[PDB]
């Protein structure tokens, strides 16, 4: 999946320009995660962020979920990837990062029994209420 990376960037840009002020931002960050699924290629989370920081209150839950979709099947490196974008070190005030972060670990390591079951077990012991126990 990494040695056959012919995706197209300009189609995603020729749909980017027609994005008006609707809630299509979630519809675009689910679109790129589909056509970069398992690719482990982060360029939209690199080349622009101010358009990504426009939508809120569930799109942050969707965007950090889409980070796990691009890294599907990423066994050891996905742990240290979100041991960089931790549930408590990005920002302690936003529960949508730590909610969709734990949801992203489940998206990566589906059908893989290991410590990540126990790692998510211990963080459902100590968690907040609403949009932490969802993605957990």
């Amino acid at each position: 999946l990494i040695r056959n990376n012919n995706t197209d960037l300009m189609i995603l840009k020729n749909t980017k320009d027609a994005v008006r002020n609707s809630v299509c931002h979630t519809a675009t960050v689910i679109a790129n995660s589909f056509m970069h699924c398992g690719t482990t290629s982060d360029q939209f989370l690199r080349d622009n962020l101010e358009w990504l920081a426009r939508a809120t209150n569930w799109a942050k839950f969707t965007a950090t979920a889409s980070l796990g979709v691009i890294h599907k099947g990423h066994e050891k490196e996905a742990l240290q990837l979100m041991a960089t974008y931790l549930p408590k070190d990005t920002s302690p005030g936003s529960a949508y990062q730590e909610g969709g972060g734990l949801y992203a670990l489940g998206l990566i390591h589906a059908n893989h029994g290991g410590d990540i079951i126990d790692y998510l077990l211990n963080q459902l012991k100590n968690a907040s209420n609403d949009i932490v126990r969802h993605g957990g």
Binding site: N4, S33, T62
Partner: protein
Amino acid sequence: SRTGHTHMPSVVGVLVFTQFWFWFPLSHFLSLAYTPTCVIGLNKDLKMPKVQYKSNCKPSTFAYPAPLEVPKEKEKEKVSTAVLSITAKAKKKEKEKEKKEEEKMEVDEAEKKEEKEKKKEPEPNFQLLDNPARVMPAQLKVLTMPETCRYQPFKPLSIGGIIILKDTSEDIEELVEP
């Protein structure tokens, strides 16, 4: 799936994906139903040997261009002058003026045909492919085994996934591990 059975992730992944009315972030679950369209020629436990095998397509070639990213640069540039009048015989006698000026002083320009038609017909449908080779699932039956190489397959190869090659007689080679 491959052998007549059905996948448990591809069913569960698509049915919760039907529930995108009531919750948009359930749409991440469709990534479970993404199964590869590739074959894998792993012969030993570690070696994937670099093998060459070919196609049997009926006339033609296909398969994964995605090329077109032009903005269609267009020009209005003109409106055709449609004055149909004494103009018609006036341009005709002007073309008579060129039959004294062109063909009597210097015009010897020429061009050649059928160079661009020549490269099309001897084409492949014998495309060679290394170990993790993609193939459209419609062409799991019109592929061709690598009989022209030394290293020829052993498992019945008719559907995509993973196989063993029979790495044949001695001097085993051709590692790739990126």
